[PDB]
């Protein structure tokens, strides 16, 4: 037997410790990507609406079962644009806090014409970091979820488990989110760097 995920945190109820990055200063030398991709993820949500077969609307309503405030950039208020960037801000903080320096090898630069997909493959070393980042998505998600739950002291959320323990079907939420960020870094050429074990050596 060879485990597909041949890696471990080697750490240690269950208390998911997040990653401390607010204390350390966030480098802003790559702000051309920080702000652009922060609104690009929400720009991809506009493409998700046309796939939902229900378009975007201006008025707030619960009947369209979609985002009610999604507006074309001509009449799109920046109040929501200036608050949707926060998850991306900490996402870039998270991947840079784990001693992973990012270098811009290249030097350049209502519909998101460039399509960001997740069905393509990627190298093992770089994808391992994305899965580690996806783990940080879950523990931070688990941390805030358990803070509300810990007020009772009895019972626990069914997904309050370590990231390696949960199966793939419940992993695709954080898996695709981390991969999608890595895919955006892939076609542009962002180099982030901190093993080579054959299948025979991975057998039990």
């Amino acid at each position: 037997y060879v485990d597909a995920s041949y890696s471990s945190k080697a750490e240690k109820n269950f208390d998911p410790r997040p990653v401390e990055t607010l204390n350390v200063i966030i480098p802003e030398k790559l702000d051309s990507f920080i702000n652009k991709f922060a609104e690009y993820t929400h720009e991809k949500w506009a493409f998700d609406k046309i796939q939902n077969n229900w378009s975007y609307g201006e008025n707030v309503d619960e009947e369209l079962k979609t985002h009610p405030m999604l507006r074309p950039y001509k009449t799109f208020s920046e109040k929501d644009k200036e608050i949707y960037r926060w998850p991306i801000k900490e996402s870039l903080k998270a991947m840079i806090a784990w001693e992973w320096t990012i270098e811009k090898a290249r030097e350049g630069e209502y519909n998101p014409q460039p399509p960001d997909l997740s069905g393509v493959t990627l190298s093992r070393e770089l994808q391992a970091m994305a899965e580690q980042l996806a783990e940080n998505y879950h523990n931070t998600w688990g941390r805030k979820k358990k803070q509300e739950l810990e007020a009772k002291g009895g019972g626990t959320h069914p997904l309050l488990v370590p990231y390696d323990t949960l199966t793939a079907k419940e992993k695709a939420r954080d898996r695709e989110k981390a991969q999608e960020l890595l895919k955006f870094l892939q076609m542009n050429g962002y180099a982030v760097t901190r093993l080579d074990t054959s299948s025979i050596e991975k057998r039990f």
């Binding site: 269950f14 019972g155 069914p158 488990v161 370590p162 323990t165 949960l166 199966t167």
Partner: protein, 97 residues
């Protein structure tokens, strides 16, 4: 009677977690604790191996601690893998399981 409860796997899994969580309970007498442990042992003997996956996931987090509460899970895991070894080892798996 829990042999063919695949259609109600969600409720059965919740039952297994609750009885297991009861076993790891403070303010329980020794006589009461073994009754809970005996119920958990009996349930895992007839429940299909596929429906024990979530319970095993919880045991993975707890058993390696090897504290005083780990005695019952060790016996539970020993009986589970001895009974269902074909389910994990043989490429064709256990018959009709």
């Amino acid at each position: 009677l829990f042999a063919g409860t695949e259609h109600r796997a969600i409720m059965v899994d919740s039952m297994l977690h609750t009885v297991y969580r009861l076993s790891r309970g403070r303010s329980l007498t020794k006589a009461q604790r073994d009754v809970i442990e005996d119920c958990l042992m009996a349930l895992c003997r007839y429940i299909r191996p596929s429906m024990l996956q979530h319970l095993l996931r919880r045991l993975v987090f707890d058993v390696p601690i090897l504290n005083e509460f780990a005695k019952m899970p060790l016996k539970l895991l020993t009986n589970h893998y001895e009974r269902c070894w074909k389910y994990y080892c043989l490429p064709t798996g256990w018959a009709n399981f």
